[PDB]
Amino acid sequence: YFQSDIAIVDADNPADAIQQVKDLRKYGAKLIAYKSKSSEELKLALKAGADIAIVDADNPADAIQQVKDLRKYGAKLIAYKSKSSEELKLALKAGADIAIVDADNPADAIQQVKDLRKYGAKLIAYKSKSSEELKLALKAGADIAIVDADNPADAIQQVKDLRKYGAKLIAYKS
């Protein structure tokens, strides 16, 4: 939370969210991201002191509505995650700031990064337990490296490795 630029919360309920935000906010974390399938929960998280609202909606119609609800509410940093680069572009066209690439497949995921970079996406994020795959995503034009290690030791080493490589924005999921 010191070496990382962004702290990502899942917390499975609102009251956990406003508590987990308050924990991070007072003690360590700089930028706080919160993910939810509920735009109303995301609004509460932002009010509680989160910086980045990650829209988690599985269907494009719901995603566009949620991005627009958060844009009107005054959200400053809206992110959307999809396995579809078409759907990520829909979220950018609705006013999302951050496209999070989430293809199940390193070849495919790295191509989504190139396609989003070609498209002109301002901020692309990429998640991996492979620090070497995160370096390939950054060369391909990703801006945010999301560490996804299976334990604390591997997470701490991924952050160190990506700093030395030159990663400007590193995110960690608690």
Author numbering: -3 to 170
Verbatim from the authors:
Here, we investigate the capability of a deep neural network model to automate design of sequences onto protein backbones, having learned directly from crystal structure data and without any human-specified priors. To assess whether the model could perform sequence design for de novo structures, we tested our method on a Rosetta-generated four-fold symmetric de novo TIM-barrel backbone, a (βαβα)4 topology consisting of an eight-stranded barrel surrounded by eight alpha helices. We had the model fully redesign 50 four-fold symmetric sequences for the backbone and selected 8 designs for further characterization based on ranking by the model PLL and other metrics (see “Methods” section), using no information about previously confirmed sequences.
In the structure, we see that the C-terminal His tag for F2C interacts with the surface of the beta-barrel, which might also contribute to the dislodging of the C-terminal helix, although 3 of the 4 symmetric subunits are folded as expected. Since the structure is a closed toroid, the N- and C-termini are proximal, and we see that the N-terminal tag is partially resolved folded against the barrel, displacing the C-terminal helix.
